[model samples]
Target: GKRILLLEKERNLAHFLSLELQKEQYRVDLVEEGQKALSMALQTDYDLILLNVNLGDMMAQDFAEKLSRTKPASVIMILDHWEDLQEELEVVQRFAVSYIYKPVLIENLVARISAIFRGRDFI
Candidate 1:
């Protein structure tokens, strides 16, 4: 089974997205706080990580930097706005395997996730 870690601060969206991913047959773990997710990330192996830049407990850059040093899975940096992406471009480029901007459509997000896994299959 493909296991995914989702670090989204918004509860409703995280719930919905996790359900959708579950429907698509990917196992998803939802976490709201950055520090908790970071700890879980270090302890468990995920096939993919979907990171929300707005995770409330810690700085996004700090989380990315710490995780990147011992990355356990492929990371998809999720940004809420174009401005956020622009602001965090350095961190994104250095750490993420891919980036997704929100107002994310579930289909597009799932497609991107599938694409990443597909790429991994080849590599």
Candidate 2:
């Protein structure tokens, strides 16, 4: 009974992630490259979004739209690993999403997701 928007690029393991989410009986909508993800963000809603910020160039306007709804909604960012993660501290703080470093492990990834939803009372 969960819904998620997955915004990783074609280059990443987007397909694999989709399958994993599907395992949880989660419906994940894969947003294509460019403005597509942003457009989809507003048009179709979800309980949360698994955002791969490797796409990297969106403005505040688009992000606000992603959060425009009154219903419970959220975002989880998967950022490229930075040894000094605070190197990009500003962007990291901006989305207000739970996050994880890159080179993701399915076990941990899924666990964090479970906890995220559980904490929000969405599970």
Candidate 3:
């Protein structure tokens, strides 16, 4: 019964991810805008947050930081295939527990997410 906040701008991709995550028995809330994401984060107690690095209105780091201050949700950044190595490294290490690149494979993504939760319990 894990709750997730999925912040992705692309409508098609967001829907695909939402359906797949739902199949995994996760409750997911899809958000397209950064401000709205922030608002929802304040209102909901999400276990994990999936953030697409290609945000339009604000920088991903800013959103990550704001969310960090608001909640303890495990953040995972979804990186673009051609994303800059320098920026990706900075954000992943500083904000996210881990990251996954585009052209995402649901099995692997779900595996990694499960690992995060498992590791948290073990610790």
Candidate 4:
């Protein structure tokens, strides 16, 4: 089964994403802080990682960089607000496979995630 590590500060948002992904038959692990997220990524093997831009302890970009160094094959998805898209894009460029804007519908979110995995496998 596919496994994903989700780093999000908002409990409701994290829960919603986890539930949606689980329904798609993916194993989802949710973490609310950047440190915990990094720890999980380092300790476990994940097929993908979904990171929120504003995690409590560190920026998602920084965490993504570390994760990428540790797990180069893991696909990375970044979630960001529209207002910070440009800056976040620059920060996440090397580490992220795709970016999903906030307030996204479940369908679109799942589509993007699926696309990322498909693309990674194709490579």
Q: Best-fitting candidate, measured by TM-score?
A: 4
> In terms of lDDT, which candidate is stronger, 2 or 3?
3
For each candidate, the alpha-carbon lDDT, in order, equals: 0.75, 0.62, 0.71, 0.78
1-119: candidate 3 lDDT, tens digit per residue: 68888877667777887888899898999888888887887788777877766567876677777777856554555545546435667655677776666676666666666676676
Clashes in predicted model 3: 0
**Tens digit per residue, CA lDDT, model 2, 1-123:** 678877665444678877888898888887755366666766776767766545546643345445545422345454455653456556656554665677776656766777777774222
Lowest summed lDDT window (length 10), candidate 4: 114-123
Worst-scoring 10-residue span by lDDT in model 1: 72-81
Across 2-107, the per-residue lDDT of candidate 1 in tens digits comes to 8999987667777888998999999999887888888888888788878765577776667776776787344655646678777877767766777777787777
* Candidate ranking (lDDT, best to worst): 4, 1, 3, 2
Q: Return model 2's CA RMSD, one decimal.
A: 3.9
Instruction: Give stretches of model 2 more than 4 Å off.
Output: 10-12, 56-74, 83-85, 120-123
Question: Relative to the unseen true structure, what is the C-alpha lDDT of residue 12 in candidate 2, on a scale of 0 to 100?
Answer: 47
Cα lDDT, model 1, residue 37: 81
* lDDT (10s digit) by residue, model 4, range 1-123: 689998876677778878989999899998877888889989988888888766779887778767767577567777878876676677677677777778777767876787677764221
Query: Which ranges of candidate 3 are over 4 A from the true structure?
Result: 72-74, 82-86, 120-123
Q: What is the lDDT of candidate 4?
A: 0.78
Candidate 1's TM-score:
0.85
